[model samples]
Target chain A: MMQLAYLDRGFYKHYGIIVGESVYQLDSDDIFKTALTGKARFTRTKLTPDWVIEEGCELDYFRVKYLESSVNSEHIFSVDHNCETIAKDIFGTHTLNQHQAIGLVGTILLTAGLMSTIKTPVNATTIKEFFNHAVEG
Target chain B: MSSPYVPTDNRMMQLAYLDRGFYKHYGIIVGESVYQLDSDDIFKTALTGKARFTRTKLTPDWVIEEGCELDYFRVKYLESSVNSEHIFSVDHNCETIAKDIFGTHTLNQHQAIGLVGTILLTAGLMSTIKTPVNATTIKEFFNHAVEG
Candidate 1:
């Protein structure tokens, strides 16, 4: 099955699409390593699988279709075109899967700022819970 | 200030603040009649006293450009609703249904900013952040973006 995956970066999370063991994402090379250094990094510990956020597709068909899409470009990422936008495009526009993808991105962006400032402990689990609440509410 | 502007034409979309500006609602106007989406997921045109913003610029020609009919909003919203599991999320709420009828999924500037404000207030970040008072009417909420 196709999967929505994320890298829990403490104060923030980065999202991507996973097919089998390979993770395909935009702007993977720009994650900040420190105040002095920034570079590309992806590992098993950093990457955690979420849910299968798609419909009407076989794994092989999705893999081939995704690989052939124009999601992997060298352009700079912006709010309109980022890792989350790319993942949403894989499902095409105006689909339920697309809306869910957008919702997940919206949740992450909204909570990330709060997580950075709040005194209470917050982690991936907290983010997941908030997203689920928004969905189920 | 001038009186609240009402449209003279049919097939115009309307917006309003519900529950004292905490939520929003959408509907379509058909020549002196108003139709809104009901809880049963159908349009109830016999309703009254909710619309506060009407897009005069979004003419029938524009609706046609988007490949929709004046009476087909309910059908379109339902069609789009099938794809969303959480139609109530800030990203896909009543405003989303309006945008769906317009052939886009991106939220307007007002909706996006309002969403951030709502989240901040809900998370008790109000102590650190101060959200502006909500616009009393949907037209003011859009900051006259719909006026053009």
Candidate 2:
């Protein structure tokens, strides 16, 4: 199964496409370089995601598109263009709109306890309810 | 300029904090009235904190030109609640209704930054800050949401 996966990076986290045990993601180092100069790169590793958000059927197609995305591209990586953008783009390429591809990216942070405020109670169910209202409601 | 004070004259789309700031409840404000999808008591206490309004160079006239008055938005919002099931999700909820009335799918700066912040934080680029992720973008998207 192809999975939308995330890795905990202390204060923040990293997202990647996981197929089997191998993971494909945008290189963290390339992010800064691409922000300075509009060039993109990708990396693959045998790292485990802290958790899987969702699973899918098209592993080969997702893998091919992810590799192809790194090769022929003029997209820059910035606050506007980051891993989520790439993940969304990959979903677009696959003709799928995974929940994470949409606005549920916020839910993941709230769920992982990486992002929160004292005013809001952060948990799986409450966070989902929150985005459902915020983005969709 | 941004201010915490909600405007009385300008028709502002307010995103109110919900669940202490984890989620947002969308409403349209015209004069002193706040129009929301649900006006029930459940939402009354759940929605907390000061709301953020859309910032755009395009004035209220633009909204009128788009074949909608501020009250028309309220009407549509009320109609939506009456006609459809009021289930909130990432695909269909208050924002979708607002966009349907406004006739656009573009997101405002606050939403764009909020989404970007979520993505960046997942990538370990930024630390968890506040609920409504506040940051200035090179290009403001609120104008685009209405203009297009």
Candidate 3:
């Protein structure tokens, strides 16, 4: 079994949140698969994993841009605008643990107006909820 | 040590306010103010501000921990805080931002007198009039330094 951060049965790979010392896994419906279900067929948006901040890490802009460019430069999408100009240094350095890598790609996608095309349920929860709950302290 | 910029405003407060747009929602703070950077204009260009990432408040502890520690988090919050929805919009006119920021992107007569040396260096640096300008090239010289 490939050890992903978290997985739900046979559906899709998911994200995890770390609070204190324990890891909490979050599994939800595959957003990408759903986006491809209807006549749309090929969805231009790419869904990214959720990221959680930890106690002792810094947000690394260097690594974040590297991964962001890799995802943006991918030739699959037809829109094909290299958003390296956009996602430059707005990202953090260390935080988010394992899910940080993919979450960055998602963040870049969101910034590029690409992720905005995909639909999210009205009540869908996000890592922001956890951040508020925990960091509010 | 006594300081003039204390009591109400200080460098720490200024730095905190500069980054508060995105950091406020994340709950990250320094000296009781949120600190994190957001906005296309801030990071869209090269570094101009002097390099120092300390607050004189939380920085004493924030610095010693360098090259150590693991586990981290990333969060997103702030609707309509920072994005191209307004700036770029449907029109996508970049010159609007340039004009608003610099007053004139090119240069006036008086300005040209002061900028003569810079223009010569830039023309030589960008590789069109020449080539190979070390860590800096024609794009940065031509004001098209939008690269990752």
Candidate 4:
């Protein structure tokens, strides 16, 4: 079985706590499967895992968009407008882990009705539970 | 070694608060106040009479009701604390929208992102265009990325 650190069974993965924006890139198949459910420590310790989780996808999407275009002048993020903009960072390394920041800003812009359809998730449990638990802690 | 924003190590985190040693429960407080469910103990404690029923005093005086029933010897937890009702209600909106926008539903998040990039790749790494995946293309793409 894949270890929790790599497979990401959620809290069962990543040794449990997700205090901030943790980054772990997946290059091979085995490692990639592991990363799906865990969290790690990387950059921007200003926020808690709860904050990080809620904003994860949004941040990832934007980071991909900025990085892909900045480097190659390609609209890698153009996925029928409704797409999550995966081309924003093909390898994930090219883009910044600034997804957390993007999420924060994007959230506000969304509430103000500026960015139209940013995004949240079909499942906010991981992040939601983390935050709800974190703040309560 | 005295920064306010310093992070906590995991071991202590593993043994932190919510471990009142009363009954059967798991609770950890990564924060100075409030409470968090860092493990099954905190999560399991909810229905078990093993631990003290403490709610976030920060929010209200008592999380559990006054004089609620709890039996440490024979405490049992239901299956719906993390799942069941509230979970779906809370996450339904976000999930629904993501499907509406992201447009590539494969369930596994990692696979989905990879698929997104692969799809965009056909457009020279800059096209927002999406192709209809009938059966052949989907199979071809899967075989390509998924190792044998």
Candidate 5:
């Protein structure tokens, strides 16, 4: 008997801020690399990043960290959520006012994904700035 | 004095503390704008607020002051390798173990979606990491994620 199997050879890009505990996805453009112009704005006692990626192209290289390190392991292709919460707090959303909480952020992130779809690294910046303003609603 | 620094190395379940100092040194306060710093850094700088440290073996004990309190935390530093000097490299273990076994938890699928590499790329939750650029990312799945 003969068996055939194929591994999906595909690269996935994700955004994550290094905090004290784990890594979490930014989920929105409110904290993209370009958006965080200054050095970093910490939340005092909070041991995490307070911003997200400002601008990023479709290029996975510049978009997010993409590695899974371990010496011994089988089937190294799955995402776990346990580390999500730790990285999420870096934004310090808990500190943001309710008005800026869910509603405001949803619009911002949705816009980023829209842009990422058709935009390339070459013109992503100009396009980002344009749509960035267009999606202010 | 307050507590030991985060471990510099690890073995199986054993580990070190997250180098939260990274956030303190790099992070800024939107309100302060001028970089108010975290309690860890504040403690190092002798600022007012929680997690304040007065002094250490390098400084006089009395220098800690009266109201100053020490924080029970230390930052776990990551390196590119045993000989590397660049601060804030990726914590490979955190991705491998899902948690720092020493501290913190793991990331969700949507969260890890953009990780540059797996277990080898992550040091911990939000610790430093230097991602090695690879063709696997641009040549495959990520390309589709960007397209789809």
Candidate 6:
């Protein structure tokens, strides 16, 4: 089974794909290369990410470690709860609270999944602005 | 010593901790929000909750704390091929373990018991590990468990 997880190692966070014993970490987004070339290689690292998969890393520890260390913290993927309150507060035609709005904005960005595994980095301000453009405009 | 920095507002708290990727890995969507927890709790909840909240064998200790340190309890307990005992030994006190795993060094009675039970479960010596299982005992028990 293929598993895609966004890891939060306290200090930093990133996205990765785990295939069996191998965990490949995603890299940062170079808007230049991505916008023009339209293809990006999600590089693998050589560090054991702080996070863990239930399956033992015994099949091959070093190989896993190698890929893990090289893990690049970049754009990750996430989904939101399908709650009406959350949706309304985030997307409704009203004055939404800041926290809920940002959380919703965060959800909106992730809805676009990884295309070519390119990193589309975003933050709270960016997300809030995106919402304003979509709703206020 | 300094006081713990606790976010005052719920909204601020969520914004600081609610990384999209975090939800994907540890989120538990309740009525309207995603409640994040540790991997073992996720596993236990999956096995025990079965997608419903009623009569679930879930506990607060199992909950993964966001906005703090990334947790390795699930990783350490499940993976032991490379001296799990050693990794845990670096910070061998309940305070350290609790802080690293549960986001706080001071655990309540229930949380303490839950973690101890979890570590013991990981060693595959269920019902064997006891409370106050010191650093030496933890190491010794792990050796005995894995070597067996």
Per-residue alpha-carbon lDDT of candidate 4 for residues A33-77, written as tens digits (9 for 90 to 100): 223333212221222332223222233454456445534221111
DockQ numbers for every candidate? Answer: 0.02, 0.04, 0.02, 0.02, 0.01, 0.02
lDDT per residue for candidate 3 within A1-137, as digits (tens), equals 10112222221223332322333221213322211111111111222333323222222432444444422221111112322221222233445443444343333222222111111122334444434333212
Question: Per-residue lDDT of B1-148 in model 1, one digit per residue for the tens?
Answer: 9899744332344432122132223334334332233321101110110112222222332121122222355334323322111111223324433343333436554443333222212222212222221112211222211111
| Alpha carbon lDDT at A60, candidate 4 | 45
Measured against the true structure, the TM-scores of the candidates, in listed sequence, are 0.21, 0.25, 0.17, 0.19, 0.18, 0.19
Expressed as tens digits, the lDDT of each residue in B14-129 for candidate 5 is 11122344421221111111111123332222222122111112211111111211110110011112121111222322243212211221333222211211111122223433
Per-residue lDDT tens digits for candidate 1, residues A1-137, read 44544444333444455654555443322221110011122222123344223223233333333334432211122333224344443444533455344333322222222222322345456566445423212
Residue range B1-148, candidate 2, lDDT tens digits: 8778733232344322222132333334433333333312211111111112232232232222122222555334333322111122132223433342233436553343233222211222121123421111101211111111
Top candidate, metric TM-score: 2
In model 5 chain B, the worst 10-residue window by lDDT is B68-77
Compared with the true structure, model 4 gives a TM-score of 0.19
Alpha carbon lDDT at A16, candidate 4: 15
Model 5 accuracy (lDDT, Cα): 0.24
* TM-score, model 1, chain B versus true chain B: 0.20
lDDT of each: 0.30, 0.31, 0.24, 0.25, 0.24, 0.31
Worst window of 10 by summed lDDT in candidate 4 chain B = B71-80
For model 5, how does the per-residue alpha-carbon lDDT over A80-135 read when each residue is reduced to its tens digit?
Answer: 34433332343354444433332222223333433443232321112112211111
Candidate 3 Cα outliers beyond 4 Å, as residue runs = A1-4, A17-27, A34-137, B1-148
Off by over 4 Å in 6: A8-13, A29-36, A46-137, B1-148
- lDDT tens string, model 4, B1-148? 8766633212111112222332222222222332322223322322232222122323222122112121111111111112211211112212322232233332343332222222112112121235687797677545524333
In model 4, which regions exceed 4 Å deviation?
A: A1-137, B1-24, B30-148
Q: Rank the candidates by TM-score, best first.
A: 2, 1, 6, 4, 5, 3
Decide which is better by lDDT, 2 or 4.
2
lDDT, residue B22, model 4 = 27
